[PDB]
Each structure stands twice: as structure tokens, then as C-alpha cells.
Design a protein around this ligand. Structure first.
Ligand SMILES: *[C@@H]1O[C@H](CO)[C@@H](O[C@@H]2O[C@H](CO)[C@@H](O[C@@H]3O[C@H](CO[C@H]4O[C@H](CO)[C@@H](O)[C@H](O)[C@@H]4O)[C@@H](O)[C@H](O)[C@@H]3O)[C@H](O)[C@H]2NC(C)=O)[C@H](O)[C@H]1NC(C)=O
Ligand SMILES: *[C@@H]1O[C@H](CO)[C@@H](O[C@@H]2O[C@H](CO)[C@@H](O[C@@H]3O[C@H](CO[C@H]4O[C@H](CO)[C@@H](O)[C@H](O)[C@@H]4O)[C@@H](O)[C@H](O)[C@@H]3O)[C@H](O)[C@H]2NC(C)=O)[C@H](O)[C@H]1NC(C)=O
Ligand SMILES: *[C@@H]1O[C@H](CO)[C@@H](O[C@@H]2O[C@H](CO)[C@@H](O[C@@H]3O[C@H](CO[C@H]4O[C@H](CO)[C@@H](O)[C@H](O)[C@@H]4O)[C@@H](O)[C@H](O)[C@@H]3O)[C@H](O)[C@H]2NC(C)=O)[C@H](O)[C@H]1NC(C)=O
Ligand SMILES: CN(C)CCOc1ccc(/C(=C(/CCCl)c2ccccc2)c2ccccc2)cc1
Ligand SMILES: CN(C)CCOc1ccc(/C(=C(/CCCl)c2ccccc2)c2ccccc2)cc1
Ligand SMILES: CN(C)CCOc1ccc(/C(=C(/CCCl)c2ccccc2)c2ccccc2)cc1
Ligand SMILES: *[C@@H]1O[C@H](CO)[C@@H](O)[C@H](O)[C@H]1NC(C)=O
Ligand SMILES: *[C@@H]1O[C@H](CO)[C@@H](O)[C@H](O)[C@H]1NC(C)=O
Ligand SMILES: *[C@@H]1O[C@H](CO)[C@@H](O)[C@H](O)[C@H]1NC(C)=O
Ligand SMILES: *[C@@H]1O[C@H](CO)[C@@H](O)[C@H](O)[C@H]1NC(C)=O
Ligand SMILES: *[C@@H]1O[C@H](CO)[C@@H](O)[C@H](O)[C@H]1NC(C)=O
Ligand SMILES: *[C@@H]1O[C@H](CO)[C@@H](O)[C@H](O)[C@H]1NC(C)=O
Ligand SMILES: *[C@@H]1O[C@H](CO)[C@@H](O)[C@H](O)[C@H]1NC(C)=O
Ligand SMILES: *[C@@H]1O[C@H](CO)[C@@H](O)[C@H](O)[C@H]1NC(C)=O
Ligand SMILES: *[C@@H]1O[C@H](CO)[C@@H](O)[C@H](O)[C@H]1NC(C)=O
Ligand SMILES: *[C@@H]1O[C@H](CO)[C@@H](O)[C@H](O)[C@H]1NC(C)=O
Ligand SMILES: *[C@@H]1O[C@H](CO)[C@@H](O)[C@H](O)[C@H]1NC(C)=O
Ligand SMILES: *[C@@H]1O[C@H](CO)[C@@H](O)[C@H](O)[C@H]1NC(C)=O
Lengths: 131, 257, 131, 257, 131, 257
């Protein structure tokens, strides 16, 4: 589906917080004894509404809520950390969960170079058909 | 029940990844490309004043609380921190579970202390949204723990594409989470202001400033409640936006005009 | 292996309970504040012993217990929610965990249509061998 | 240790998926096709009367409890709910952990209150089966929480292939989980019946009915225990299946013939 | 990278403990009521420093600590059991996360036997070109 | 932040699997080939005496504890078990969380009871290593729970490639986790020995033996502290390696020469 923002307003800027994912730690700062407290583990970034991404993001999260809430009703886990790993697994199963029928619509195999390795090397058997 | 949407970018636009169709062009090379994300209700234009915000929450029994995690969030202007008891002194909200900390970026923390009937085991969001804590989104409010209202999204990304100030604002409350809820903004433990929906955080901090400097605090053991007249004004969201007032004393109520 | 029911009796009917997985929520019922209590999140179904499935199912669960119990002895998790996701991962690794040798016994790739794309299109080079 | 079996359907038959062999014909397109499932011991023909059921459970120390989840279960005829103490009044079973609720579908809940030595930290199943709670299967019994005995299975499915009544039955117990356990069915807080293995749930509810209507309850402050004579009868499992009796008074024991 | 042991000393022998993973249980020992207590679920093995594996292992664990500690700072899970499953998922996504371009460097498909099925069976069309 | 290393074997050598490069020759046929593993600091040659070991740990607030699991570990010579209080009697370390048990294989458990300032909510490893418990590695020390110091590794394996004795050694401690920490080895509740870094476990068990048999225990209600003279000796790690002493009495301190 497409994302139609249907909210009263949109803050077109996302001033965000998160944890560090890239970059080596400065000396001993990685050691929990020496490192920052809970308040000081965050980084920030600022994102503008290029491609209408920020406003779509707000709408996406709004639309996610129903499915997400129903999922949480059906789980007995108190805290759920596995949603993204499960999506990765489903990503793989959608593609590789059965037999990959080559040139079928549901099989992500490209024989492009393998076509012009076989059809190109016919000219070392029909071209070299020397009498 | 229905499949949880996953956000993906096609044709320079965010879209819900269509479950029934397979796009081999889409590439997930690593589980880092997957992200879970918290967006605040603020950014959709909702009223963030305490009176309007609290009317969105309500007590309910029979529903176990649920928690889901998120990796990144949005800096808030408005967060809330509730210390609500029954009139018999028993706590209305549960202690924060182990590992649940307050929302990390709040410009204003609206700390509401007070009382109400609390007709239910847990306090939920009436509109189905989440209480966002530090990288954990819960279906319910925990006691004395700072939260932003918000909702959660999940994304597949591609592979290539000033400090922090916080001010606490304190409120007394009676009849919390009912049709007749009365709020009071706190100047000090004996000086208060009758709250209204139209008052912004910055107006409250200026009104406070004006009370302290003009010398309009309670100079007795008694409680002092300043009312503001309707003429003193205060439809623009936060991200797109002196000594003239006169105070006179009419518990001990009063007016500011 | 095959499933041999070795129980004294078999209730050939499975009157089952579970949570809802399909269908949109009726209005606001998905919102936890408004939705059903813990007692009212269940659906039901009735299954009969077609293909001897119900009686096999009873036997399967009985036979599962040893392996399952030993697995729980060896884990330090208090509550285990990851068994099915781990089976999905093992499903994928069994098939795609190494190099897929095409036409090998352990590689689920079908070149069926890819055979009759190459062997069919030899008649635009040997058939069109025009002098 | 050994691999956990996975159920799959081949040749119109359920089979354990053979680990060492690979079947490319088998298709797992989604993680929804995987299911974990709870089947009740009832459905294998085990005795479900309280005396026979309790002899399958026993106390043991040194073994940490373990819990595994399941998505779907079987409606039970017989569930059990234990409130067992030592003769010194200390609890024998632990409080239900947070998030563990009683089994969702029970036609009869056998609620046993009473005492026993409880020589061990937790109560396990002597036959290695599980105590099935609401979508959580535990190795041990939690206090005052309704459970069905059962076992767990895991399946790969293909992609294409009256209300709820519950009645509680109350029992006193002495010497719980030992060779000489005495049970008493409760009519009211002063009127009881000596239990036996041959009594079904429906017989107990009829016997109760007959006691109340015939007026055979304790009409003193004292405890009244009705015994049933062996001649009054009561090998068929639950899924495949008046005022003639005379009561006379011989604590105060009595006979029904 | 390569593993350079940079510790003061190395105990070249690994006397290890773990839980049982292979072998059927002796009678009823799998039943938690009858089985061993927490103290008695362990097996042991002894490993010597063949291929310098033990000393590398010690160094590997030392080098793992920074990344591991930073990961634990960034998670809100109290106890983390998903690291290995997530590595399995990333293993699969690195290989099968996009379209597999055959004979490309990032696509683990071997057409070896499929080459000498097609190039071998050209001698039932050019060899059988009977006039 | 940076990617967690994964160990793999190439060219008869353990290597960190290079994230940016893909080796199709590498084979992960099952999730059993993946292993998480605990190696002890002992095996790197660190001082394992109590005085040297405790100086590696320290108290800190503001950092939530974290726990990660591991499947296999190394038998230890030296483990530690701390019962530390403040001088006002409050506990310094938290009770072991549910499911965290002591390290399974310890030849010597150094059980330190005592006091210190404890200027922080949790005790961490100053060198960033882990406290290894039973298949759970924590960033912090739990009260009265046996641990080995260690670190964690993760491996991809290929598909084809005497009992247990434990002795407890008891120590009193003052000023725990500070610059002036005083330790005392316990012979009995009234007989002690001033500790030093150079004393090995086997020396302490021999010194104890010699004290009991020679009859040098406290034969009063008072506390008796034996000092050892510097001349009595005791750079070799554990894995590569009588009645001559005379005791005389100088609380009641004394010397052994
Ligand atoms: C996702 O985004 C949606 C769009 O912003 C959110 O929709 C909101 O849903 C809630 C209930 O779930 C609505 O609350 C109700 O409002 C009605 C109407 O209130 C007043 O407004 C109308 C005119 O619009 C007027 O006719 C009435 O007289 C009222 O003065 C009340 O009757 C109900 O009792 C209830 O309070 C919101 O109004 C609605 N917003 C919009 C803009 O439609 C949705 O909640 C978002 N989801 C999450 C999870 O955040
Ligand atoms: C999976 O299904 C299996 C088949 O239904 C279950 O087998 C049961 O296993 C338990 C022990 O784990 C057995 O209990 C034992 O029973 C014997 C015999 O008791 C009486 O019966 C024999 C005649 O059959 C008679 O010779 C004796 O004198 C007794 O009168 C006792 O000696 C033991 O102490 C113990 O109680 C069950 O008997 C057995 N059932 C069957 C039908 O074989 C198995 O438990 C199931 N697994 C799970 C996890 O539920
Ligand atoms: C991984 O292995 C590494 C190599 O074994 C470990 O390195 C250790 O790191 C810690 C701090 O994180 C160091 O401790 C510091 O030591 C210095 C020096 O102390 C004395 O030694 C030098 C001579 O070498 C001398 O000049 C000084 O005067 C001292 O007498 C202190 O100044 C610091 O305050 C601090 O205590 C270790 O020394 C260091 N070991 C080595 C051999 O380099 C690393 O910790 C391991 N990682 C984990 C997680 O276990
Ligand atoms: C797993 N963690 C250690 C890493 C998580 O890191 C991030 C998780 C999302 C984003 C977000 C964004 C902005 C729009 Cl997608 C981002 C993504 C990639 C690169 C740079 C920015 C974001 C989104 C909505 C709300 C808040 C933030 C940034 C970092
Ligand atoms: C993940 N959940 C939201 C969905 C789980 O749903 C189900 C999980 C198993 C079944 C069961 C069955 C019956 C035999 Cl497989 C079923 C499966 C597919 C479609 C219809 C019925 C079942 C099995 C044994 C015991 C109890 C039930 C039904 C639904
Ligand atoms: C999932 N569990 C039920 C099985 C885990 O089993 C093991 C997990 C690692 C090892 C270890 C080793 C030794 C060197 Cl890799 C091993 C691996 C395979 C076969 C035999 C031995 C090991 C490693 C470092 C420290 C301690 C042990 C052995 C068994
Ligand atoms: C709350 O007050 C208003 C008055 O207009 C009205 O909705 C109602 O009388 C009250 N509600 C309840 C539940 O008593
Ligand atoms: C004001 O009240 C709060 C809450 O009871 C109390 O903790 C604080 O000490 C008081 N402050 C002063 C200055 O009296
Ligand atoms: C009110 O003004 C005083 C005077 O400077 C200040 O100290 C106090 O923090 C202000 N109150 C709030 C809620 O900001
Ligand atoms: C003392 O009392 C009144 C409030 O009752 C206040 O308005 C007045 O300004 C106070 N006095 C001074 C000097 O501030
Ligand atoms: C229980 O009673 C029976 C009597 O037949 C017998 O097995 C035994 O004497 C008793 N068991 C124990 C453990 O005392
Ligand atoms: C009967 O006993 C139960 C359990 O002690 C008690 O809760 C209940 O109030 C009693 N009922 C009557 C009618 O006395
Ligand atoms: C026994 O009969 C009475 C009379 O109708 C009824 O109220 C009571 O619930 C019955 N007891 C049980 C255990 O069903
Ligand atoms: C009163 O007492 C006896 C039991 O002791 C009972 O059998 C009798 O029926 C009772 N009386 C009535 C009128 O029910
Ligand atoms: C600890 O004692 C030593 C004495 O040499 C010195 O480092 C310092 O004076 C003391 N440290 C503190 C923190 O007081
Ligand atoms: C020695 O002290 C310990 C710890 O206080 C105590 O538990 C034990 O009973 C004492 N032993 C003797 C023999 O007095
Ligand atoms: C000290 O020696 C006595 C005498 O045999 C022994 O019982 C005791 O356990 C020893 N102490 C330690 C700490 O091993
Ligand atoms: C009694 O006292 C002293 C220590 O004060 C000790 O050295 C002596 O050996 C003890 N007596 C005997 C007979 O062991």
C-alpha cells in the first residue's frame, strides 16, 4: 500500500535520539565501570522531510498501531524484542522457503552473466567446427 | 489480527511493504537495515497541555500490560510524570518494572501529583497509542516515570542514502481521570495557579517568574491560589512558533488582571 | 520417522482454543483500553481425525516431551519463546547454509524452465545457420 | 540430549520430520506455518479423578523450574487448582509468576485445598509431562492457578489444507502427595463427602444437588461427613459417553445407601 | 583479521564444562522430577592447543569484550539470549538477502555439474546432426 | 559501537570472521555449529589471590546491569563469593536474580565476608571483563553467589573436526574496595591469619592444617590473629606447577617463624 498522511498536522522535522552503532570507543569508555551513565549513552541527528519521508514515517507509525496492539494481545511475553529478527526470517522464507524455480516470478536468481557465459562460449564448438 | 506493517522506500517514497507480492529488487543484506522507531503524538498536532493530555488516558482491569522495544526516538517538548493516589492514600500506578527508565529527551516534564478514583488496575491510552519510555513502549503508565505519548514503526533501510535542557513543571490534581478534574500549577508549596488548557509551558514559566519577582507568593502558613482572568491570552504547534499584569487578593483565592 | 499412536485411548476430536490471527478488528476493539479482558481473547475450532491427524498429533506431543525437557534443562532462560524461530533458521541453514551445487541432492534450485530456455533457443543459431 | 521433533504432513500422514534428510518439496514460506501446540493427557485416556491425578505429581528440590510457550490448546474437561499448605501453615506452592494465568478452557476445575508434608521446593509431574497454563507450559505447579496436564508439539503446516461453561468442584485434603492421602468433596463449609476414584464430576454435582434438595446438610456447628456405600456404582472416557438413595446418620460420620 | 595472543600467559589446555547435546537419556533421567539437580547436569572435556586454537580462543574472547559490552549498553533486555540466532540470520542475509547473480562474487551458487550437463549434452544435437 | 566478532577456523588457525568479505566456502548447516563460550582470566596469567583480585572490582552508580548467556565454560581454580556490608549493616551487593546460580566448576571458592564503604549501586569489573556465573555472564557482582572472572567468545565450528572437588576458603575483610583493604584468612571463628598477596590456596590449606594439628587455635573467648614473617616464602601459574615452623604469642596478635 501507499502512505497517505491523514493527521491534523505534521512536524516535518525529526530531531531524533538513539544509541551509537558505528565508531570505536575512545580509550576505556566502553568499560561499564568507567563509561557514561544511563543518561549519557545517546546520540542525536536531525532529519528533514526529503521525499516526504518524515511525514510518511509519522503516518506509518500511526497505521502500525492496530496490528502491533493485536500482536501484543496474542503474545504472553511481557517484553517483546523479537519482532525485527522475525521479519528478517520471514524475508528469507518468502524467497528461499521452497525450491527456487529459475526464471520463475518468486525466485530471486539472476543468470544474466550465466546466459552470456554459455551463449558466448558456443563459438568455441560451432566456430571451431574445423574440417 | 493482521500482519505488522514494515516500512520500505520505493520511487522516492515510504510505503508499506506489500506482504502478498515479492520484490526481488528489495535487498536485506543485514539485520542492521531493520529498525524499530518511536514517533511522538506531538508531531501529529495533538493538544499537549496537561488537562487535554490526561483525558486521553484511563483506568481498566482485566488486560495484562504489554511492552515492546524500540531503538530510536524523537526528542519531545512534552512528557508527563504521574504520582496519582486514591483519596485513601493507596497508589494508583505500579512501580516501574526493572529496566524501564524515563523517556530520554523531554524539554518539559509535566509532573502531576494528586488524587482520583482510579477505577481499574492499570492506566491505558484511550486512543490505543503507547507510553514511550527509554527504548521500551508500554500499553500502560508506570508510577513516577517520565513518558512521551507515541506510536511505533518498523523500517527496512537501504545500505546507502545545542545540548539537552529539561525543565520540570509541577501540578496538583483532584479527581484525576474523570469528567470534573481540577488542576493547579505549583509556584511553591503554598502558592498555586488554577490551570487551563490554553496555558503553554513557556507561559507557566513566565507566570512563575513574574510571581517570584513581583513578590506574589504566599507569606503566611496558608495555601494561596491565583486565578487568571479570561482576557489574558496565551492555533500553532510548538515547532512552528514583562510587568504589565496586576495581582490583587480577593485557603485564600485571588485574581490576576 | 513415522508416528505410531501407542496411548491407551485417543480422543479422535480436537476441540481447540487459540488467539485470532486473521481478520480486521471490529471498530475500536483492538485498543487495549476498550478491548476484551484476558478471558475473552480466544477463538475456537473443531477438528476431526481426517488422515489420522488428531491421534498422530497426540502421539507427536507425547514423543516430543523427552527432547523438549532435555532442552529446557540445558537452557538458563526462565521462559522460552524462541523454539519456532530457531527451527525456521535451521530450516534455512539446512538448505542455504553453504554453496548451492545445482542438480546436487542438497540444493533446492529448479532449472526446469531454464533448461527449455537454453535448449529451446539453440534453434535461433543452428536453425538460423543460413548460407 | 536430542533434537526436538517437528511435525510435518507427508502422504496424508503426520510424521516426524527426519533431521538427517532434506526434502526440497517441503515448503516453509512463512514463520506462521510453524505452530506450537498443547494436547491434554485426558485425550490419551488417563484417569482424571482427583485421587488418581494428584498421585502423578510430586515434590522435588534442586531442579530449577522451566517454562515454554504454546499458541493453541485443547478445551479440557478436567483442570486442577491447588491450595496446599504444610501443617505449620506455610505455603507449599509458589505464587504464579507475573504473566502466568490459568488454563483458558476447563469444564470442571478441581479446586483442592488442604495439607501435606511437601518434601521439596517445587511440585513436578512424575511422568515428565507439563502443567499447561494460559499459553505457557511449566515443569511445576503454581499456587492457586488453574492447570491442565499435557504435553507440547511443534508443527509445520502447509499453506492450504455452544459457549464456554465452567464449574468449580471443591475438595479438602490431608496428607497430600503421599501414600495415605484422604480427600473430601465439599457440599458446604460444614457438609462433606468421602471421595473415591470412581466418582465422576457429574456424579459429584448430582450428589451435591441431591444433598441440598433432600435436606442432608449439617444443621449444627459441627462437621458432617457422608460416606457412600460400595454398592452405589458410577471403562469409558468423557468424550464417548433422582431421589432413590437413602441417607441416615450413624465430627459426625454417616452412610448413604 | 588474524588472532594475535597478546596476554601475559596462556594456559594451553582447556578443561571445559557444558551441558549434554548428543545421546539418548538413560531410562527416566530426562523427567525433571527424577533427573539430576542443577549441580549434576554438566559434562566435561579436555582440549589441547592443536592449531594454537586454545590460545587463540583466549585472545578471541578478550577482543570480543569491547564490542560485546557496547552491545549490552545499547540493549534494554536484562538478559540477552539472541546473539547467536541473530548471527545465523546475518549469515543468511549476507548471502541470500538480495538477488543471487550467478557467477558473481557474492552469490554462493555452483553450476559445476550444470555446466557439464549442458555442454556435455550438445553431443545429442550436433553429434546427432544426421543427414 | 562495533560488530561483535565471530570466531572461525581458516588455514588451521582461529580467525575473526571478516564482516566486509563473504566466503562461500564457509558453511553454516545448523545453528548448533554456533557456540558461545566463557574463558577465565586465570588462563591469561592474572593474579588470582584475593587481595589482587578484589582490586580489579569497584562500585559505580548510573549504569544498569546487563547479562548475556554462554553455553560452555572452563573449570576454574579460583572463584570468589562476596558477602560485603557497609559498617551500618546494609548490604552492598544485590541478591542473585532468579535463575542466576554460582559458577559450576571451582577448585577453590574464596568466600570473603566483611565491610567497606561501597560508594555505588553495583560492583563492576574495572578492566571491563565479566563475572561468570552458571551459563550467565553479568557486568556486576551478586551477593553471596560464586563467580569466576572471565570473558566471552562466539564461534562457528565445522561439522567434523577424576571427579570434581571444591574447597571453600573464608576471609574477613575491612575497607573492601579501597586503597587500604585489610584481609584475614579464617582458621576458625576465633583464629585468623593476616593475609598477603603471595599466599596460594594450597599454602593456606597447609597453614590451616598445621595450626589445627600443632594446637595453635584460640583457647579463650578472644580473637587470635597469627602473622607470618616475610622470610617464610610461598612466578608460575597454577597449571604449570611439615612441622618446621614455630609459633609464639607476642584481641591478641602473634608471629609465626
Ligand atoms: C491515528 O491517527 C488518527 C487520525 O489522527 C487518530 O484518530 C483519532 O481517533 C480518536 C479515537 O480513537 C478520535 O477521538 C474521538 O473523537 C471523537 C470526536 O471528537 C470531537 O471532534 C468531532 C469533529 O472532528 C466532533 O464532531 C465531536 O463533537 C468532538 O468535538 C469523539 O466523539 C470520541 O469520543 C473520541 O474522543 C480522534 O478524534 C481521532 N482524530 C482524528 C483527527 O480523526 C488515531 O487515534 C491515531 N491512532 C493512534 C494509535 O494514535
Ligand atoms: C507418553 O506415553 C506413554 C504411553 O502412554 C506414557 O507411558 C507411561 O509412563 C509412566 C512412567 O513414566 C508409566 O507409569 C508407571 O507405571 C508402572 C506400571 O503401573 C501399573 O501397570 C502395569 C501394567 O501395565 C502393572 O504391571 C503394574 O503392577 C501397575 O499396576 C509403575 O510400576 C510405575 O511405578 C509407573 O507408575 C505408565 O504406566 C506408562 N503408561 C503406559 C500406557 O505404558 C508416558 O508417560 C507418556 N509421556 C508423557 C510425558 O506423558
Ligand atoms: C584484554 O587483554 C589485555 C592484555 O592482557 C588487558 O589489558 C590490561 O588492561 C588493564 C586496564 O584495562 C591494565 O590495567 C592498567 O595497568 C596500568 C599499568 O599497571 C602497572 O604496569 C605497568 C607496566 O606494564 C607499570 O608501568 C605501572 O607502573 C603499573 O605497575 C595501570 O597504570 C592502570 O591503572 C591499570 O590498572 C592492564 O595492565 C592491562 N594488561 C596488560 C598486560 O597490558 C585487557 O584488560 C583485557 N581485557 C579484558 C576485558 O579482560
Ligand atoms: C540498533 N541501533 C544501535 C541503531 C539504531 O539507529 C537508528 C534507528 C533509526 C534512525 C532514524 C532515522 C531517520 C529516518 Cl529513517 C535514520 C535512519 C538511518 C540513518 C540515519 C537516520 C529514525 C527514524 C525515526 C525516528 C527516530 C530515528 C536512526 C538511527
Ligand atoms: C500464532 N497464533 C496467532 C495462531 C496459532 O493458531 C493455531 C495453531 C494451531 C491450530 C491447530 C490446528 C489443528 C491441527 Cl494442526 C489448526 C491448524 C491450522 C488451521 C486450523 C487448525 C491446533 C493443533 C493442536 C492443538 C490445538 C490447535 C490452530 C490455530
Ligand atoms: C548448546 N549446547 C547444548 C552445546 C554446547 O557445547 C559446547 C560448546 C563449546 C565447546 C568447546 C569446545 C572446545 C574448543 Cl571450540 C568444543 C567444540 C566442539 C566440540 C568439542 C569441543 C569449548 C570452547 C571454549 C570453552 C569451553 C568449551 C564444547 C561444547
Ligand atoms: C460527567 O459530567 C458530565 C456533565 O456534563 C456528564 O457527561 C456526566 O453527567 C458525568 N459523567 C459521569 C460518568 O458521571
Ligand atoms: C515541598 O513539597 C515537597 C513534596 O512534599 C517536599 O519534598 C519539599 O521538601 C517541599 N519543599 C520545601 C522547600 O518545603
Ligand atoms: C519559578 O521561579 C523560581 C525563581 O527563579 C525558580 O527558581 C523556579 O525553578 C521556577 N519554577 C519552575 C517550575 O520553573
Ligand atoms: C505579602 O502578602 C500578599 C499575599 O497575601 C502579597 O501580595 C504581598 O506582595 C506580600 N508582601 C510582599 C512584601 O511581597
Ligand atoms: C506407604 O504405604 C504403603 C503401604 O502398603 C507402602 O508402600 C509403604 O509402607 C509406605 N511408603 C512410605 C514411603 O513410607
Ligand atoms: C466457606 O469457607 C470459605 C473458605 O474459608 C470462605 O471464604 C467462605 O466465606 C465460607 N462461606 C460461607 C458461606 O461461610
Ligand atoms: C451444590 O448445590 C447447590 C444448590 O443449587 C449449588 O448452589 C452449589 O453451587 C452446588 N455445588 C457445586 C460444587 O456445584
Ligand atoms: C437436620 O439434621 C440431620 C443431619 O444431622 C439431617 O439429616 C436432617 O434432614 C436435618 N433436618 C432437616 C429438616 O432437613
Ligand atoms: C589511597 O592511599 C594512597 C596512599 O599512597 C593514595 O593513593 C591516596 O592518598 C589514597 N586515595 C584516596 C582516594 O584517598
Ligand atoms: C562460625 O561463624 C559462622 C558465621 O557467623 C556461624 O554461622 C557458625 O555457626 C560459627 N561456627 C561455630 C562452630 O561456632
Ligand atoms: C582446617 O583444618 C581442619 C582440620 O582438619 C578442617 O576441618 C578445616 O576444614 C580446614 N579449613 C579449611 C578452610 O579448609
Ligand atoms: C593454648 O593457648 C595458646 C594460644 O594462646 C596456644 O599456643 C597453645 O598451644 C594452647 N594450648 C594447647 C594445649 O594447645
Amino acid at each position: 500500500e501507499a502512505i497517505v498522511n491523514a493527521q491534523p498536522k505534521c512536524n516535518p522535522n525529526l530531531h531524533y535520539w538513539t544509541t551509537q552503532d558505528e565508531g570505536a570507543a575512545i580509550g576505556l569508555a566502553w568499560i561499564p565501570y568507567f563509561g557514561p551513565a544511563a543518561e549519557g549513552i545517546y546520540i542525536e541527528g536531525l532529519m528533514h522531510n526529503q521525499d516526504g519521508l518524515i511525514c510518511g514515517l509519522r503516518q506509518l507509525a500511526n497505521e502500525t498501531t492496530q496490528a502491533l496492539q493485536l500482536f501484543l494481545r496474542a503474545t504472553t511475553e511481557l517484553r517483546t524484542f523479537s519482532i525485527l529478527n522475525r521479519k528478517a526470517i520471514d524475508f528469507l522464507l518468502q524467497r528461499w522457503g521452497g525450491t527456487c524455480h529459475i526464471l520463475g516470478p518468486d525466485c530471486c536468481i539472476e543468470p544474466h552473466d550465466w546466459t552470456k557465459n554459455i551463449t558466448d562460449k558456443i563459438d568455441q564448438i560451432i566456430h571451431d567446427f574445423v574440417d | 489480527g493482521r500482519s505488522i506493517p514494515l516500512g520500505v522506500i520505493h520511487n522516492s517514497a515510504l510505503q508499506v511493504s506489500d506482504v502478498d507480492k515479492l520484490v526481488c529488487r528489495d535487498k536485506l543484506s543485514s539485520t542492521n537495515q531493520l529498525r524499530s522507531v518511536g514517533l511522538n503524538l506531538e508531531g501529529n498536532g495533538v493538544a499537549t497541555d496537561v488537562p487535554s493530555a490526561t483525558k486521553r488516558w484511563g483506568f481498566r482491569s482485566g488486560v495484562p500490560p504489554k511492552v515492546v522495544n524500540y531503538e530510536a526516538g524523537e526528542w519531545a517538548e512534552n512528557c508527563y510524570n504521574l504520582e496519582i493516589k486514591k483519596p485513601d492514600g493507596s497508589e494508583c500506578l505500579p512501580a516501574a518494572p526493572d529496566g524501564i527508565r524515563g523517556f530520554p529527551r523531554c524539554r518539559y516534564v509535566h509532573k502531576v501529583s494528586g488524587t482520583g478514583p482510579c477505577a481499574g488496575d492499570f492506566a491505558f491510552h484511550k486512543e490505543g497509542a503507547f507510553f514511550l519510555y527509554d527504548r521500551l513502549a508500554s500499553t500502560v503508565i508506570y508510577r513516577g516515570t517520565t513518558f512521551a505519548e507515541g506510536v511505533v514503526a518498523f523500517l527496512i533501510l537501504p545500505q546507502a542514502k545545542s545540548g539537552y535542557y529539561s525543565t520540570t513543571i509541577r501540578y496538583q490534581a483532584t479527581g484525576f481521570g474523570t469528567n470534573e478534574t481540577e488542576y493547579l500549577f505549583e509556584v511553591d508549596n503554598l502558592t498555586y495557579v488554577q490551570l487551563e488548557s490554553r496555558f503553554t509551558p513557556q507561559f507557566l514559566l513566565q507566570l512563575n517568574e513574574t510571581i517570584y519577582t513581583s513578590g506574589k507568593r504566599s507569606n503566611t502558613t496558608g495555601k494561596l491560589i491565583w486565578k487568571v482572568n479570561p482576557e489574558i491570552d496565551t492555533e500553532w504547534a510548538f515547532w512552528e512558533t514583562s510587568e504589565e499584569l496586576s495581582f490583587t487578593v480577593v485557603x485564600x483565592x485571588x485574581x490576576x488582571x
